[PDB]
Every structure is written in C-alpha cells, then in structure tokens.
Amino acid sequence: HKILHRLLQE
Amino acid sequence: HKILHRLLQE
Amino acid sequence: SLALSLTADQMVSALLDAEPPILYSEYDPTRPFSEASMMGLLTNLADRELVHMINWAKRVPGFVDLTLHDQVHLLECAWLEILMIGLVWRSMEHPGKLLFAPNLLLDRNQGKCVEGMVEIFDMLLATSSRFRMMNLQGEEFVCLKSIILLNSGVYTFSTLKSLEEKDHIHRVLDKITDTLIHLMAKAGLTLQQQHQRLAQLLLILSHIRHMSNKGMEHLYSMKCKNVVPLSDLLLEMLDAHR
Amino acid sequence: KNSLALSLTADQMVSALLDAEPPILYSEYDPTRPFSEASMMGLLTNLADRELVHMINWAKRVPGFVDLTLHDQVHLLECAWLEILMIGLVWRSMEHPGKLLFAPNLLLDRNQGKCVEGMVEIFDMLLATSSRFRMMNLQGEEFVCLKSIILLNSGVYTFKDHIHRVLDKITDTLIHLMAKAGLTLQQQHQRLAQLLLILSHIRHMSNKGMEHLYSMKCKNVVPLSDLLLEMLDAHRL
Ligand SMILES: C[C@H]1CCC[C@H](O)CCCCCc2cc(O)cc(O)c2C(=O)O1
Ligand SMILES: C[C@H]1CCC[C@H](O)CCCCCc2cc(O)cc(O)c2C(=O)O1
C-alpha cells in the first residue's frame, strides 16, 4: 500500500 | 585546543 | 535469470538504454528566491526524478528478479544516493555549480538560501570535482549507479530463504564489477591501474552514503519546520528511514 | 616532501599495519546483570574513550599518515573515528555469530542492545556486518588494510594527492594478499569490490551511531569524556 510499492507494480 | 591535538602530538 | 547470462558488453548496453531523462525545473527566474521556494523547486524536481527512477530500477538487470518487498527496501534505502550521484554526474562539466536541471544551476552561495543546505552543497561539489579529477566515463557512472541500487540496502534486509534473495544480489553485483573491469581494460588500463581505479570508484560510494545520510536529516528538519509542503512519495521515502 | 609510505613493498605495508594494531581492551569485571540503559552506555562510552586513545597512536603508525599536516591528521580522525571503532568491533565479533565482542568480558547480543533506547537497530547493523565478514572469510591482513583505508578515505573529499597515492598503495597491497592466497584475477577484483562496498555500510552505521551519541549527549544521563564530546562535536551534528 506504500506508493513505492504500487509504482513498482503498476 | 583539542584533546586530539595533544594525543597526536604526545 | 538472464541477468547472470549477460556479457560485459550486454550489461553496459542494458544500463545505457535504461537511463532516465534529464528533467527541467519549473524555475521561474523572475521569482525572487526564498528558502521556501528554493526547497519548493528542489523537492518538486526530486519527486519527478523519483518516478523515472522507479521505472529505471525495473530495467536494471536482476532487479525484478527480487520480491516486491525486497525491491521496495532497496529503493527506500538508496533513493537519495541515486539522486545525488545523478546530480553530481550532470554537474561534472560545471565547476562550482550543481546542475539540478539545465535551467537550474545553483552555486554554493545560493545554497545558503536554505538553512543547513550549504554544507550539503559543498559535499556534492567536492564529489563532482573528484569525478572530474578521475575523468569518470558515462559507462562507469551507470555501473556505479546500479551498484548503489543493489548494495545500499543489502545489509538491512526473516527466514533462511530471505537469505537466498540476498545471494542473487551479490551475484549481480559481481557481474557489474566484471563489467567495470572490462571497461577499464578496454580503455587501455594496465591490471594495476584497473584495480586502483575500481577501488577509487567504489570508495566514492562511501562519500555518497554520507551525503545521503546528511541529506536525510536535512529533509527531516525541513518537514518539521514545515515551510515547504512535501510530496506524499517523498514523505513515505523519508519515513522509511525513520 | 616525498613520503616513505610510497616506497614500501606490499609485504612491508602488511607488516607495518599488523605491527601497528592496537590491543584488545577489557571492560569492568562487575558481573551484575542485567544492564540498565545508563550502566550499559557507561561501559560502552568508557570503552570507546579508551580505544580512542589507542586509535590515535595506531593512526600515527599507518604508513603515510604522519606525512600529513597535523590539521589534516585531525580532520581525518574526526571524520573516521566511529567507523574505525566499528570495523574493529565487527572484526573482533566475527567468530561469535550473533554477538558483539565489545571486550572479551563484554560480549553482548541484540537483546541486550534493547537495554538502550535506539541501540538495537545499530546492534543489528553491526551483527549483519560481522556475519558478512565471517561468510567472506575475512583475513586479518585484509582487515588491517580496510581499516587504514577508512582512516584515509572517509575525510578526504571534505578537504589530497598524497592521500590518494597512499590509498592506491593499500589497494595494491590488498590485491597482493588475494593473489598470495590463491584467488584468480577475476576473484581478486570481485573480492576487492565486495570488501570496499562493505565500507559504504560502515559509513552508514557510523552516521546512525553519531545521531545516537548526540541524543545521549542531549539526554545528559551518561557522562561523556571531553575527548568523546570533542569527536562528536566535529560532526556538527
Ligand atoms: C542538494 C540535495 C539536498 C538533499 C536534502 C534535501 O532536503 C532533500 C530534498 C531536496 C532534493 C533535491 C534534489 C533533487 C534532485 O532531483 C536531485 C538531487 O540530487 C537533489 C539533492 O541532492 O538535494
Ligand atoms: C554499538 C555502537 C553504538 C554507537 C553509538 C554510541 O552512542 C556511541 C558511544 C558508544 C560507543 C561504543 C563502542 C565502543 C567501542 O569501543 C567500539 C565500538 O564499536 C562501539 C560502538 O560501535 O558503539
């Protein structure tokens, strides 16, 4: 749910 | 004046 | 893992192709500088650079072989070091200046416009000077930047399996070392000069760590002083450093 | 003007560094357990103070160091002192997985780290470094090289030509030791890189440690030597 986590996915 | 000066010079 | 199946030429090409672009600042040269606005410019730029950095990281051989949580940790640890090495690289041909962007060159005097900033400027300028002294090559720079991504958090990572995750990183690191030596050998350096230059280059990473540590404390104080709002990404990055 | 350091062979460099090694010191013989935050920090800062005195005398014996001006010697030590203490601690602890051998009679684990606010995080980093060195089979001859590299390198950018030549001589010496130990060329440069990359982590630990020391100064519970206070102040932290 971290922003970094999401961007690393998306 | 620093302890360090004294130690380096002793 | 194709990452470990790359020749030195192929690793260099992969890294060169992965390079993010040089961004412009929204710098309005008519607006008189305040501490709030200069930090406004810098944090805005950092936030935009961070997005490209995340996508660049995905393209560094070996990186996406890691679990997502491991990728998050490595970027959390390395982000400011990676910004900084990039700034220093951009600034190399501008003695006494930091080229945050082609439209935003600042010298140490402008650094004093922000409390606690000038000391950090001086360290960055000294690094740029060192890069210039060494005649650092673009191919060497991209290797070092990928070394930072993979190395900086490798010792601050659960189970015996989480350890295998660390082993892959070390193998990729060794490949990049092989690549650096390959570049130097191609540049006509003797064996002795290759080992010496490799050391010189890797020792600068210690200074980059130091600058990043100091910068992180600076950012924290800016957050506490609350004179420039911080992007949510930047806040979470800072938060990861506790 | 010319430094004797640059004229040394690899064996002479290795021998000079081994001979220069400071002794392993003891902590207090009081067996009172467990510790308090005040008493643990008391023992650690007392030990740091005593090791520092030996460090300043060790540095004077690192080839090329006394060729610098007094002021450059002071700068380098002020910048590197905690890194140098830490690499020494990590080296001493290498044969004790899971523990930090501060002294032969003060061998602590991470749980004991929790006795001090903000300390367990640092213990964990040191323990990781120790484990890494153990897994790389770090040799004493390599260790003394790395330690001298820290002394010369850490402050050099915040000033250099003499220093960089001496650093080069130490790289030559490290490579000498690895070839001597039977490593191929590719293994030598890979190992050289592996060791130097650990120095980045040591810098990180030192920086976290310096913030910890500052907070301890501010909490004003644990007496700190004038020497320790002056080494801390140098970091304007
Ligand atoms: C001068 C330094 C201050 C760090 C501390 C600051 O408090 C952190 C936030 C400012 C970041 C500025 C910055 C932006 C960028 O795109 C690349 C960079 O290397 C930097 C940077 O190095 O900022
Ligand atoms: C665990 C670490 C905490 C540093 C922060 C502390 O706040 C610094 C003061 C305590 C120093 C302890 C110490 C003593 C010594 O002889 C060798 C060392 O490596 C250390 C040391 O690493 O202290």
Numbering used by the authors:
A (entry chain C), B (entry chain D): 687 to 696
C (entry chain A): 305 to 461, 464 to 548
D (entry chain B): 303 to 461, 472 to 549
Wording from the paper:
ERs and their endogenous ligand, 17β-estradiol (E2), play important roles in the growth and maintenance of a diverse range of tissues. The LBD is crucially involved in most of the receptor functions because of its capacity for hormone binding, dimerization, and interaction with coregulators. To allow the crystallization of ERα bound to the environmental molecules acting essentially as partial agonists that are unable to induce a stable conformation of the LBD, we used the ERα-Y537S LBD mutant described previously by Nettles et al. (2008). The structures display the canonical active conformation, with helix H12 capping the ligand-binding pocket (LBP) and the SRC-1 peptide bound to the “AF-2 surface” formed by helices H3, H5, and H12.
Whereas BP-2 acted as a full agonist of both ER subtypes, ferutinine was a selective activator of ERα, and α-ZA efficiently activated both receptors with a slight preference for ERα. Some ligands, such as BP-2, α-ZA, BPA, and TCBPA, adopted a binding mode reminiscent of that used by E2, with two phenol groups hydrogen-bonded to three polar residues located at the two ends of the LBP, namely H524 (H11) on one side and E353 (H3) and R394 (H6) on the other side. We and others have previously shown that this residue is involved in a key hydrogen bond network including residues from H3 and H11, which are part of the docking site maintaining H12 in the active position. α-ZA occupies a bit more space than E2, especially in the H8 region on one side and the H3, H11, and H12 region on the other side.
